């Protein structure tokens, strides 16, 4: 829904209010995401690297 | 993450821990002798 | 055993360091003048030049 970004898309058990869209946590860094179709709350970890 | 990366320490905790007890337990055997 | 804050040392340096960690990472969402924060907008927003 126009943000973007790379990573590994996981479940996640978290439980927005009904007028959430996305998530962060600290130095606004996305963490969850609520797709537009199913609305069920998916979780974003970035692939490894090293 | 962001490309920041922590690396672990070469000594671990049960090591530190095993350094400190050889050197109380020599203090307390032997005196400063062992030095 | 009851009494706290007497290991404030250890506890000063862990969070100097947290903070400067912090501090970097949230530098990221800077305009620093330019029309954006992030760079896929900018590409995807106009011409090269
Ligand atoms: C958007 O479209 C999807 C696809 O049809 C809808 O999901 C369906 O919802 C009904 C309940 O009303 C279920 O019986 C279907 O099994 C669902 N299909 C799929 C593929 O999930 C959805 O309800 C629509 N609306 C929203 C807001 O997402």
Do not use: H
């Not at chain 3, 912090?22 to 530098?27: A, D, P, S």
């Amino acid at each position: 829904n126009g943000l973007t970004g790379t990573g590994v898309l996981t479940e996640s058990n978290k439980k927005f209010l009904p007028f959430q869209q996305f998530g962060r946590d600290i130095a606004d860094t996305t963490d969850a995401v609520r797709d537009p179709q199913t609305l069920e709350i998916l979780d974003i970890t970035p692939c490894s690297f090293g | 993450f962001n490309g920041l990366t922590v690396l672990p320490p070469l000594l671990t905790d049960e090591m530190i821990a095993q350094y400190t007890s050889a050197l109380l337990a020599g203090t307390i055997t032997s005196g400063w002798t062992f030095g | 055993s009851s009494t706290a804050s007497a290991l404030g040392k250890l506890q000063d340096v862990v969070n100097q360091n947290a903070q400067a960690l912090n501090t970097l990472v949230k530098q990221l969402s800077s305009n620093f003048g330019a029309i954006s924060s992030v760079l896929n907008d900018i590409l995807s927003r106009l011409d090269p030049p």
